[PDB]
Structure 1
Amino acid sequence: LLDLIWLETILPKTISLAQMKMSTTITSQKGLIKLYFLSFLITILISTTLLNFHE
């Protein structure tokens, strides 16, 4: 119960599955350049307006 499942679950397996999900969601891009430049635009709009980095 303890040595083979739960201690094997809390530290390594949750971290491994979290990185699994994150790396799956990050690199599922379609390769379109319109979406890439839209991402660049919303990045610029977030940095200029919401964050207010020119203070």
Structure 2
Amino acid sequence: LLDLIWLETILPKTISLAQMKMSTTITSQKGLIKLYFLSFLITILISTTLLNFHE
């Protein structure tokens, strides 16, 4: 229960599953130039209006 399951579950397994899930979200891009430049526009709008990196 402890040293094959729960002490295995809370530190290494959940960290590994989290990094796997973040890896699959980052690398699930459809290769479309349109969507990447639309993300760049959203980046510039968040930087100007929402983060005030131009002031």
Query: Which TM class, normalised by the smaller chain length?
Result: over 0.9
Structure 2 gaps of 5+ residues are none
1:25 deviation in Å? 0.6
Q: Which residue of 2 aligns with 1:12?
A: 12
When normalised by structure 1's length, the TM-score is 0.95
Pairwise CA RMSD of aligned residues?
0.6
Structure 1 gaps of 5+ residues are none
Any runs of at least 4 consecutive aligned residues in structure 1 with deviations exceeding 2 A, and if so which? none
Q: Which residue of 2 aligns with 1:24?
A: 24
| Identity fraction in percent | 100
When normalised by structure 2's length, the TM-score is 0.95
